[PDB]
Each structure stands twice: as structure tokens, then as C-alpha cells.
Amino acid sequence: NDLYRRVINRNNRLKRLIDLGAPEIIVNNEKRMLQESVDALFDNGRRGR
Amino acid sequence: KKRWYVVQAFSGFEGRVATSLREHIKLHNMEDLFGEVMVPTEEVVEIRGGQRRKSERKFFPGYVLVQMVMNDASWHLVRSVPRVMGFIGGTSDRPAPISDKEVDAIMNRLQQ
Amino acid sequence: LAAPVTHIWYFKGVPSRLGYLLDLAPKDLEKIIYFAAYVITSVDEEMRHNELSTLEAEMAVERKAVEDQRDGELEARAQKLEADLAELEAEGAKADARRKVRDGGEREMRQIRDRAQRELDRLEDIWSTFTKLAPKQLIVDENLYRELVDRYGEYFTGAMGAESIQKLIENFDIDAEAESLRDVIRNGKGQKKLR
Amino acid sequence: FGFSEIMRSTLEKDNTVGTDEALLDIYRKLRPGEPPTKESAQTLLENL
DNA sequence: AGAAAACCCTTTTGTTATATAGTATTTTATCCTC
DNA sequence: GAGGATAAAATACTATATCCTGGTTAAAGGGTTTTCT
């Protein structure tokens, strides 16, 4: 439940930021955070902390 | 040229970050390098229980835009302040500056 | 999801199964997938040959123009040196001032020459990158890619992140790779055959 | 440290010039991915 | 009208790991060759 | 002198019997709201 919550939060934030318009750098960092969230959802602890 | 850069910060706490950044630039008195630090904040409205009410949302939520010339001393100074994770850029050794067009866009919105 | 995301099982687990399909080392995937470097998804071609001749002419023009501007700057510096000599010989100032101004002038001239050399080297490196631009090549040093895209916005497409790997997989035939690998197995020998 | 062959051999193969390069190299390992500078390196080494 | 106690949200220096034994894959370093 | 090939080292992943009972299960900070004086 907590991991799904994290993924949904980050997805909503990135969707908003794309719709509202933002510089490429912020969008790229948000996509990185989404990637890390999904990686943690599927296999927690395989990469990084 | 004081190209704009973005520094991440802990969620929530943002104002303390900017204020401490100003104080720390005072401390080392490198005023000819740091020019301006702003946290854009639009004001919108919502109806809570059938009543129009105000609200204050900071678009680009969680980051702080700052002016900085690219000197490693400035790099350490910015990285040193509390509650500042790091520089969001193209690589750690040197951050990446946001293009003038994006800063023009945010200036237009903040004006509006 | 609002942006594509890669499945960790087929990316991290040793052996890296995305690394074999695309022929990329695990570090390159670690970079492209976590937004740390750009990757050239698709690079244009024989349109190149023609535009390459034309752009060789254009870059010769650009290099000559920049060198002319730098030569004008050096000429202005030489005029400043002449004014310095006039100041030296006009009134009474012994070795101290003479040496100071001459050291300053030679330092400025050498700095201008170094700037010219560095800019010309940068443009030559840009030319080398363009003439040797192929898919699955990592462009670190963001500023370099920004220069390449601003100058030659066509002739290639560069991306960064999972969607870049998706584009790579889309533009990837599975038969030619198998044929090449079977050829290498038959003939290669050594660690090349082993890989 | 002139009474053992190991120390002299290490001295011969050091590739470190002066003192600042030593501190910068130590910085490159203690804390990777940072802009090395003498002041910060000395401060961190002392603080450790 | 101001102060104090009660909601609603968010999020969690490098720590301390006293490991072995086995295998399998990536660096890298150095040696040999042209 | 430069490039390729092979050892070396350096990291990355995997595994290490059966069964039973007892105590805990979040805190802390910031921002906002309501009642009492």
C-alpha cells in the first residue's frame, strides 16, 4: 500500500508539472523520481538504498 | 553572466532554505557572485464547503531557483546550507543552467 | 504512467538482458535510464553526404569568420601595445614600467591565441562528432549536445531517459543482429566470439 | 622511515607532488564526484 | 482581539554491520605485438 | 609509440534443518482552527 501510494503521488505530480508547463530539467528530475519509485515497487533494495 | 540554476530542497520547508542561503552569502560576503533567490508562489482560489476562499500554491513545488556564477567556491557555499540536497543539473561536477527561454516563461507567469 | 518506465528485472539482474539486446554496457544503461546522459536514438544518413559537403563549406566559412574576428581583436591588442610603447618612450620610466607593460601585453596576446586555438579545436571536435555520429553513442557533457543540436538540429535525434530506450527498441530489427552474431560465432574466435 | 625496503619502495612509487595534490587525491576518494579544492579538502580531512 | 490547545498533512555523519564459500560478469592494468 | 589481448581485481548475486510461545504495532514537526480570556 505504501509503495503504491508513493508511485501514485509521484505520477500525479509529474502529470501536473507536464500539463502546467515547466523547464526540461525539472521534468527530467521528476521522471527520475518516478523511475526510482517503480524500481522500488517491483524489487526493493536491488539498486541503491 | 548570472545564469539561473536550480537547487533541490526538502519537501515542505523551502522558505528557511532561501533565508539561510541569503544569510550564508552574507557570511562569506561573496555578494558579487550571488544575485537573487526566489521561490515562485502563485495565488489561486478554491471553494471549501460552499465558500470561496484563497490559497497559495508554489508551482515548481520543492525546488529553489538561484542566481550563481560557476565558481567552485560558490558551489561549496550553496551545497553547505542546511536542507539543500544538491544541484539538479546535467552532472555533479558542474550544474546545468536553465535556458533563458524558460526563465522568460516563469517571469511572464510570475508577472501574471 | 505519464512517462515510460523500465522494468528493473530486465535491466539490473546479472546478466543485464537489456544490455545484450541493445549491445550496451550496464553502466551506459545505468546512465541513460536514470537521466544522467543523452543517447543518440536515430541518426540520419545519405542526406548527410550532400549536406555534409555543403556544411563543410559552411563550417570553413564559420571558422574563417571567427578567426578573422579574433585576428581583429589581436590587432586591437597590438594597437594597445603600441600605445604602451609610446607612453614608455614619451616620458621617463625605466625598466620597471617597460617590463610590466610588455609582460601584460604578451600575456594578453598569448591568452587571445589560446582562446582562438581552443575555439578552433572545439569546432574541429564538433566536426569529428558530426562525421562520426552513429546510434547508441553516449553524449556526456550536456553543453556539447546543446551545441550540436543548436548548430545541426537536423541529421540526428537525441533523447534521454526510458523513452529513449523505447525508441531504440522500436528502430531495431531482430534478424540482422542474429545474422551478425551467428557470423561472429562462426568466424570470430576469442573473447569476441565468447561475448 | 629509512630502515625498511618497503617504505623506500613506496616512497619511490608515490606519484604525489608536493602536498596539495595529496589532499586533492584524498578528496577524490573520501567523497567522490565533487569539485576538489584545497580548503574544503583540508577542512574535511581535519574534521574526520 | 490575542493566546493556548486541538486538527490535518508529511516523512523517516553515517553510523552499528565483527561473515564464508562459491560462481559469474564487468572493469583495468599491464604485457605483447606491429 | 599505439593498439589489442590476457590476467587480475573487483563487484554482484546466491545459499546456509523442524516446531512452539510472548510483547509491540510511531513520532515529530509545520501549518491551520477554535475556544477562552
User: For residue B55, what are the β-bridge partners?
Assistant: B44
What are the contacts of C153-156 at 24+ separation with CB within 8 A?
C154/C44, C154/C51, C155/C43, C155/C44, C155/C47, C155/C48, C155/C51, C155/C130, C156/C40, C156/C42, C156/C43, C156/C44
Spatial CA neighbour of B40 closest among B18, B24, B10, B25: B18
Cα separation of C10 and C19, whole Å? 9
Task: Name every residue in B having a CB less than 8 A away from some CB of C.
Answer: 89-91, 96
Nucleotide with minimal C1' distance from the CA of C27 is E26
Q: With CB atoms and an 8 Å threshold, state whether A26 touches B89.
A: no
What are the residues with a C-beta under 7 Å from any atom of nucleic chain E? A 9; B 11-12; C 14-16, 19, 25-27, 195
**Is residue A27 within 8 Å of A14, Cβ to Cβ?**
yes
Three-state SS at C38: strand
Helices C47-90 and C95-131 sit at what angle, rounded to 10 degrees?
A: 180
Domain B4-111 CATH (choose: 3.30.1060.10, 3.40.50.300, 3.90.1300.10, 3.30.70.940): 3.30.70.940
Rounded-to-integer distance, Cα A3 and Cα A9, Å:
10
- C99 by DSSP, 3-state: which? helix
Helix H, strand E, coil C: the string for A19-30 is HHCCCHHHHHHH
Is the bond preceding C15 in cis, omega lying within 30 degrees of 0? yes
What resolution in angstrom units was achieved for this structure? 3.7
A21/B contact by beta carbon, under 8 A: yes
| Residue D41 CB burial class (10 angstroms; 0-12, 13-18, ≥19) | buried
Distance, angstroms, CA C138 to C1' E28?
21
Nearest CA in chain A to C37: A28
Q: Quick check: C143 CB within 7 A of strand F?
A: no
Between CA C122 and CA C128 the distance in angstroms is 10
What are the angstrom distances between the C-alpha of C118 and each of A12, C70, C110, C124, D44?
A: 46, 12, 12, 10, 35
At residue C27's C-alpha, the angle toward residues C22 and C28, to 5°, is: 50
Best of B8, B91, B92, B93 to disrupt the C interface (most C CBs within 10 Å) is B91
When CB atoms are compared, the residue of C2, C8, C160 closest to A15 is: C2
What one-letter code names the amino acid at D47?
Answer: N
Decide if B99 touches A, using CB distance below 8 A.
Answer: yes
Q: Which residue of chain B is at minimal alpha-carbon distance from A17?
A: B60
Q: Rounded to the nearest 5°, which phi and psi values hold at B47? A: -105, 110
Give the minimum alpha-carbon distance from B51 to chain A in angstroms, rounded to a whole number. 25
Strands C38-43 and C156-159: antiparallel
**Phi-psi map region of D15: left, alpha, beta (phi>0 left; psi -120 to 50 alpha):** left
Nearest CA-CA partner of A35 in A9, A2, A3, A10: A10
Instruction: Give Cα D7 distance to the centre of its chain.
Output: 16
Q: How many helices (H) and strands (E) does chain C have?
A: 8, 3
Q: Is the CB of C191 under 7 A from strand F?
A: yes
Half-sphere exposure for C172 (CA within 13 Å, toward CB):
18
Report strand pairing: C38-43 vs B63-67. Answer: unpaired
Q: Decide: helix, strand or coil at residue C91.
A: coil
CA distance A25 to C89: 58
* The residue type at C4: P
Find out whether B6 and B88 touch, Cβ atoms under 8 Å: yes
Residue from B92, B102, B1, B3 nearest B59 by CA: B102
What is the three-class DSSP state of C42? Answer: strand
Whether B93 sits inside 8 A of D40 (CB atoms) is: no
> Nearest nucleotide, C1' to the C-alpha of C189?
F5
CB D35 within 8 A of CB B72: yes
Stretch 47-86 of chain B: residues touching chain A, C-beta under 8 Å = 59-61, 63
Q: How far apart are CA B8 and CA A43, in angstroms?
A: 26
Is residue B5 a contact partner of residue B66, using CB atoms and an 8 Å limit? yes
CB C166 within 8 A of CB C41: no
Q: Cβ of A35 under 8 Å from any chain B Cβ? A: no
Residues contacting residue D41 through CB under 8 Å, at least 6 positions apart: D23, D24, D26, D27
For residue B88, give the nearest of A20, A21, A25 by CB distance: A25
